[PDB]
RNA sequence: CCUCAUUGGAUCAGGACAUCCCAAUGGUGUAGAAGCUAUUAAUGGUUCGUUUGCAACGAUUAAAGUCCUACGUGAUCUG
RNA sequence: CUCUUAUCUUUAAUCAGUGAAAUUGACCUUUCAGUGAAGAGGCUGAAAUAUAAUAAUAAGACGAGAAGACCCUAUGGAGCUUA
RNA sequence: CACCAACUUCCUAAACUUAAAUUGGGUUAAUCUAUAACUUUAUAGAUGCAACACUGUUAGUAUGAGUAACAAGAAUUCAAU
RNA sequence: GUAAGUUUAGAUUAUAGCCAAAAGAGGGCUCUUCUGGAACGGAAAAAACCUUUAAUAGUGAAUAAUUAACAAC
RNA sequence: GAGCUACCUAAAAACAAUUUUAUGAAUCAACUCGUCUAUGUGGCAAAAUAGUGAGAAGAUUUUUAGGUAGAGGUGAAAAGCCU
């Protein structure tokens, strides 16, 4: 027929070159990702010194689960565990364009296949060198923190002790009803009651003959942008770029969440101590410990705690 | 019933347009509509409305000439009013008599 | 609750009309290089699907009347032969099932 | 919310769901090829494979035997099953049935169908989609980039 | 209320066939009136060689009176003015004539010119169609070459050589067979026909006889497709 | 009903007034009974005032038909094209005479709402007014703020 | 000569401020602590039971405000 | 009940077949303040405003229904009791 | 130191001066009959003589709505197993 | 200054108003009498207030009423 | 018009098991009835369904045929019943 047509990319492979194209496809991720290991030899940006009022980039990481943990008063504390995987700099704007007072920069993990993705968005990888990533999110960065793109990211990026904000996606929880969105407390079970148990009660009053905008109904619940405030870190493990954030993180296992310095007035100026621009490995200054930890934090292989 | 009252409506929107139009024109020359169509009558000129607006909008020179006219004798007014007792009266303001 | 007004035909052809309830175009409908009828890609072909089941019921019915009876399932390979054909080594100790038809050129 | 849950629900509820798979296996065991609704097909493949599994173990096993003696309601397949189908599928590690989709049931209801089938069975061979030929211009040109690559270290 | 469920009864036959029925043979009260023959009583067999001769026939007609003559006597028995002398021009009158009602489709002329074994076989396959025939002069003069009779009818094969044009068309105009203007020659044998018993008989045509020796006619413009078996998953190709 | 009804402009068929004036009208015809009551002013009307209209008319070509009739009819034809038809069924001869009188002067024009009274080709002699007309040039014609 | 007949609750609450608690202040017959009076402010909050047919109490609280929305709200439910 | 929760079936929803009912002046059917008889999508003045569906809620259209209630009227009835 | 504005009035042509139960008068759609007319008319005589509305009657077709609601246990070699 | 009025003959319908203003009587309301009103303009929307002799065509004109108004030894 | 229902006449039927006794006694089926709640409300049904309940050898229940008729009949009186 003379029409559209749907095409896929295994559609008029043969059974040879389905293994062949597989192979090559995952070759070159090999080699593209280890081009960009470098950043710091392939002539990296002027690094400017941090000033009082700086924001410097975050990081995009997966959810790997959660675990216990102790501190040295042997208090227990459910932490999250957040895997940096494929964190590189995207894309930079100015001040000007991004229309705001502070600069952007889009950071993206993730690596994703090639093989079911629109030609627009393999085209700005290609450009930048990459494989495609999963997501990208956009981060405020002011001009000396500024990360020229195509430079990787890692969980040293973060030090225990410092308070950290994650924003991902919540759980989907489908359609719901209002007792399960809005916390309603319904009708009674029995002593006569008709058809109404889980039921909205009055929408809203007589005499304005409509309905507020904004009212709480039954719904569509989850699946939006949340974020948390003020989460301590407990721990980065640099071998597997491993973050230990406290308490929850919004998402199911295996989301993508952004992490960034903590937004909220405490902690306004504490990315001093921290790598300003980034943490480069590739300058190797000093070979990191496999294993960061905050003070408090009771590591095992240590002698059991004894309040003495 | 719309079709008869809108016959009569018609007439008194038209001359709503003729005065928003002569207002555009004489402000052009600096004369409000008020001092327009006053002084040219008191020359005893006696075009209408309608026929304003056609020499405003198609003949602008002549339109010009009748601002200055109705100028002139507002002008003469302020003159006539403003010298109390017996000053000669302006040369726009003589009135032709009829009988 | 029951309507206050009638609705109009042209409320009512925007709503019957509308591209959410229009049938969708296909995209994924080719040919089978076999027999030249038509097909879905994912799906298999109901033409020569058609004659595989044909042939399929055919050697069924062949089982049955062998067996003679319910609960005779043996206990050993089975395989299936056509006229000119005669069982191999090994074919040995496999229950055979004969048919009158040639070979088919599909089935090998 | 249905997250993470494995199963349909299928019948008049959990024991009717079993019992329904229940009857399309032992069909399946008889016959080898059988046609039914893609969502039970579905449903029931997973059965179908490790009833294998348990063929596998042996006759001996007295675990095998009592999941065998419930799965299949006809009794003659008990012997089918360790003697025939087990015996077969020796050297595979796993992928004993072959499912595909069919056209749509032509009854009026229009159900999606499929036709599930162990691997090595007597019965004609199904029409299966085949891959293109080696041959075919975007083959080759693949063919040509992959021998230069290998020669060429 | 309600209103009853009557069943509110070319739909003959269906309703009989769907319900089956038994329909007996009836016996005809006024037998049927036939005006003309099926068929030609005895098919003349063209000699080879007729064609391509730019009076003989004639004689040979002349031998075989022993077997021809002798109708030639009943013709003159029931009429005593059939002469094969001037028939022949008669005879071209008639087929010119007929031929040129096709133009006009004057169905009425034809059945006056034609019997009721032409009629069905000159417009048939002319409906939603628009012919144009012409006749352009006559190569030789026509003969009478076969005269047979058997209530009683008479035949009397004419030979004719002229030449023609024809230019069918569709019902939208488009030209389906032959050259909008070019004249071919055609040799074709013409089978007359009269009721000799009917006093309101006259002499019609009947048929053609079309020799097996005869050229090939000009073919269709359009291009045709035949198709092949259709068969169904049992069957396969041979 | 102007909604829901045509309209045009003022208009004269070939400039009728420029050169020379001339009648629309080019035909009439009417159709009579020479006995019927419904006809019976139309028959005066022939008898009395046809000759002197048709001699004040010399480019007016009159038909006059007494034949079996049922109801008396005028057609007027006219240069332009239009067709006009009257039932004179039982009309006065002062009826008759003032209609006929009507469709001479007319034009062939249809009788639809007309838009403006007045029609020029020529609305400006000195020059149409455009928002320029009225403003002031400025040396160089320098637009305002430029620094030049 | 006598007379007399819409409103609770549940759910969800929108709003007024003539403010019950929380917050900022003036005065005192304000030593401190408790209070009294007035200005300002509508911010979020303003409990659970028993006997009750309207009240009558118990134990708490920083407080258990006063009113308007056709008992605010019966095509949401109930006495 | 505090204080709700999980599972399964029914229904729901999507696909195929069949196919009602009350209801309906016309509708190209918005929010606020005003006016008004307790009263406004439609009036006055501001304001808001690409277009059509699908699934939900029930504030309003003094939403729709039944032979429901209440007072009064007729020189309209009827049952019952008597002094 | 005024302009604007309700045919209030003037102007060109005309016209002759103010909710509604009820009252006086002038025409007229349709059909039939008398006598005429002859592409559908005239003068008379007649009448079941004119409907945007009676929760009107009959029939038709919409709206609600392709909505509420309705139905066949499984596999196979299919008055079968 | 102006054109109506009485009698004779025939005849129905009507017999519950509404709001403003003025004077009384009962006791804010409620009775009684006197005056006006029933826009298409103005007063915001506006039956009852103010401007308005009937109803006509016109792409003329003059006008009426017209929610506006300019702390004080 | 008493094929429903009220009452009656005639001729016929049914009541297991268990405990008491010697029964308008007890527990509880079949059977008869219809207490309370929910569903349903153009419903499966113009009075039902699902549970829960009352009686269950008697003033019991059921079958067949006959009788009483509207100023009337019937009524363990609810002004009930009489298609
Ligand atoms: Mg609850
Ligand atoms: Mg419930
Ligand atoms: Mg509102
Ligand atoms: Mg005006
Ligand atoms: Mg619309
Ligand atoms: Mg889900
Ligand atoms: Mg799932
Ligand atoms: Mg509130
Ligand atoms: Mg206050
Ligand atoms: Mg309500
Ligand atoms: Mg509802
Ligand atoms: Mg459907
Ligand atoms: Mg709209
Ligand atoms: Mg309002
Ligand atoms: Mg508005
Ligand atoms: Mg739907
Ligand atoms: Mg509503
Ligand atoms: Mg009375
Ligand atoms: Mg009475
Ligand atoms: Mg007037
Ligand atoms: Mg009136
Ligand atoms: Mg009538
Ligand atoms: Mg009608
Ligand atoms: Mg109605
Ligand atoms: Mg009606
Ligand atoms: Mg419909
Ligand atoms: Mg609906
Ligand atoms: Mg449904
Ligand atoms: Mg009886
Ligand atoms: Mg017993
Ligand atoms: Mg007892
Ligand atoms: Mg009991
Ligand atoms: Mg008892
Ligand atoms: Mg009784
Ligand atoms: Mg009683
Ligand atoms: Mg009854
Ligand atoms: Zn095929």
Redesign the pocket.
């Known amino acids: 027929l003379h029409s559209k047509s749907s095409t896929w990319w295994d559609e008029h492979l043969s059974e040879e070159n389905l293994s062949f194209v597989k192979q090559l496809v995952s070759d070159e991720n090999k080699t593209q990702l280890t081009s960009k290991l470098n950043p710091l030899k392939d002539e990296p940006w002027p690094l400017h010194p941090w000033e009082p009022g700086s924001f410097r980039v975050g990081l995009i990481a997966l959810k790997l689960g959660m675990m216990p943990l102790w501190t040295k008063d042997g208090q227990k504390h459910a932490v999250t565990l957040l895997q940096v995987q494929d964190c590189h700099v995207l894309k930079y704007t100015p001040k000007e364009d991004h229309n705001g007072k502070i600069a952007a920069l889009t950071v993206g993990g993730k690596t994703v296949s090639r093989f079911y993705k629109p030609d627009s968005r393999l085209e700005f990888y290609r450009d930048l060198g990459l494989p495609p990533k999963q997501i990208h999110k956009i981060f405020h960065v002011t001009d000396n923190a500024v990360i020229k793109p195509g430079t990787p990211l890692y969980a040293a990026h973060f030090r225990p002790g410092q308070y950290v904000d994650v924003t991902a996606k919540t759980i989907g929880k489908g ?1 719901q ?4 969105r ?31 905008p904004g ?5 569509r619940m989850g699946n939006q942008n949340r974020t948390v405030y003020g989460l301590k870190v407990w721990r980065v493990n640099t071998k597997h770029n491993i973050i230990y954030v406290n308490g929850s993180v919004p998402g199911h296992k295996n989301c993508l969440v952004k992490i960034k310095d903590s937004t909220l007035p405490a902690y306004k100026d504490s990315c001093k101590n921290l790598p300003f621009p980034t943490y480069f490995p590739d300058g190797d200054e000093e070979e990191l410990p496999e294993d960061l930890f905050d003070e408090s934090v009771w590591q095992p292989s240590e002698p059991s705690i004894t309040f003495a | 019933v719309k079709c ?2 809108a ?6 929107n ?6 928003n139009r002569i207002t555009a024109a004489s402000q052009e020359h600096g004369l409000k ?3 327009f ?2 002084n040219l ?1 008191k020359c005893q000129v ?1 075009l ?6 056609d020499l405003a909008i198609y003949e602008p020179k002549t339109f010009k000439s009748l601002a200055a006219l109705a100028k002139r004798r ?1 002008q003469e ?2 003159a006539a ?1 403003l010298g109390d007792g017996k000053e000669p009266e302006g040369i726009f303001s003589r009135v032709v008599q009829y009988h | ?12 052809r ?8 229009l ?1 969708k175009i296909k995209n994924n409908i080719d040919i089978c290089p076999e027999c030249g009828h038509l097909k879905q890609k994912h799906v298999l072909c109901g033409y020569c699907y058609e004659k595989v ?1 044909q042939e ?10 062998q ?1 003679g ?2 609960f ?2 043996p206990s050993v390979e089975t395989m299936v032969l056509y006229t000119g054909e005669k069982p191999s080594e090994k074919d040995q100790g496999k229950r055979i099932v004969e048919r009158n038809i040639k070979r088919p050129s599909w089935f090998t | ?2 997250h993470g ?1 494995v ?1 349909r ?6 024991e ?2 079993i ?2 798979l229940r ?2 296996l ?3 065991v ?2 080898e ?5 893609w969502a ?1 097909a579905d449903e029931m493949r997973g059965y179908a494979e490790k009833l294998i599994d348990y063929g596998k173990l042996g006759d001996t096993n007295e675990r095998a035997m009592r999941m065998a003696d419930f799965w299949l309601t006809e009794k003659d397949l008990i012997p089918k099953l360790f003697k025939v189908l087990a015996p077969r599928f020796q050297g595979q590690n796993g992928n004993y049935t072959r499912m595909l989709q069919i056209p ?1 049931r032509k ?5 999606k169908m499929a ?1 599930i089938e162990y691997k090595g069975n007597y019965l004609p061979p199904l029409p299966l989609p085949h891959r293109d030929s080696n041959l075919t211009l975007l083959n080759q040109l693949l063919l040509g980039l992959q021998q230069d690559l290998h020669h060429n270290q | ?1 309600f ?1 009853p469920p009557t069943p509110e009864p070319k739909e003959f036959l269906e309703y009989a066939r769907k319900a089956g029925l038994v329909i007996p043979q009836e016996r005809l009260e006024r037998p049927i009136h036939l005006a003309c023959t099926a068929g030609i009583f005895d098919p003349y067999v063209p000699p080879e060689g007729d064609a391509r001769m730019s009076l003989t026939q004639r004689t040979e007609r002349l031998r075989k009176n022993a077997a021809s003559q002798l109708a030639i006597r009943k013709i003159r028995e029931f009429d005593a003015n059939f002469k094969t002398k001037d028939f022949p021009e008669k005879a071209k009158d008639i087929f010119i004539e007929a031929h040129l009602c096709l133009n006009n489709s004057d169905h009425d002329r034809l059945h006056t010119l034609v019997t009721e074994h032409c009629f069905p076989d000159m417009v048939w396959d002319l409906k939603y169609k628009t012919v144009r025939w012409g006749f352009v002069e006559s190569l030789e003069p026509a003969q009478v070459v076969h005269v047979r009779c058997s209530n009683m009818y008479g035949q009397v094969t004419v030979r004719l050589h002229t030449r023609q044009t024809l230019a069918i068309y569709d019902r939208f105009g488009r030209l389906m067979y032959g050259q909008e203007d070019v004249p071919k020659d055609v040799l074709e044998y013409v089978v007359f026909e009269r009721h000799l018993m009917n006093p309101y008989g006259s002499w019609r045509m009947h048929a053609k006889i079309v020799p097996a020796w005869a050229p090939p006619k000009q073919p269709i413009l359009k291009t045709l497709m035949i198709p092949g078996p259709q068969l169904k998953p049992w069957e396969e190709y041979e | 009903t102007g909604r829901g009804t045509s309209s045009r402009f003022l208009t004269s068929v070939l400039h009728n007034g420029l050169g020379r004036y001339v009648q629309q009208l080019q035909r009439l015809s009417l159709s009579l ?7 019976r002013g139309a028959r005066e009307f022939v008898e009395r005032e046809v000759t002197d209209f048709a001699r004040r008319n010399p480019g007016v070509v009159v038909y006059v038909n007494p ?5 008396p ?1 005028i057609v007027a034809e006219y240069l332009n094209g239009a067709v006009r038809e009257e039932n004179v ?2 009309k006065s001869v002062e009826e008759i005479k003032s209609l006929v009188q009507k469709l001479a002067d007319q034009s062939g024009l249809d009788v639809i709402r007309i ?4 029609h020029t080709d020529n609305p400006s002699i000195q020059g149409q007014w455009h928002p320029f007309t009225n403003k002031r040039t400025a040396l160089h014609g320098l637009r305002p703020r430029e620094l030049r």
């Not at chain 3, 609750?1 to 009512?12: D, H, L, Q, S």
């Not at chain 4, 629900?9 to 959990?14: A, D, E, I, K, Y």
């Not at chain 6, 838009?115 to 007045?118: G, M």
């Open positions: 359609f009803g209002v007792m399960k809005w916390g309603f407390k319904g009708q009674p079970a029995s002593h006569g009651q008709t058809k109404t148990h889980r039921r909205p009660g009055a929408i809203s009053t007589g005499d304005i003959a409509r309905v507020w009212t709480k109904m039954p719904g | 008869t009252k016959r009569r409506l018609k007439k008194r038209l001359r709503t347009l003729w005065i509509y008020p001092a169509i006053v009558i006696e209408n409305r309608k026929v304003l607006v507002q007014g302020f009013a | 609750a029951a309507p206050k007004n009638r609705r109009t035909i042209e409320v009512n925007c709503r019957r009309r509308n591209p959410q309830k049938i089941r399929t019921t055919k050697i069924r019915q062949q089982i049955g009347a067996e009876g319910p005779r399932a | 919310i249905s849950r199963y629900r299928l019948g008049l509820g959990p009717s769901r019992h329904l009857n399309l032992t069909g399946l008889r016959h090829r059988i046609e039914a609704t039970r749509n009854e009026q209801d229009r159900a036709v | 209320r209103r | 009974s020479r006995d019927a009551p419904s006809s034949r079996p009739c049922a109801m009819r069924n039982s838009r403006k009274p007045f």
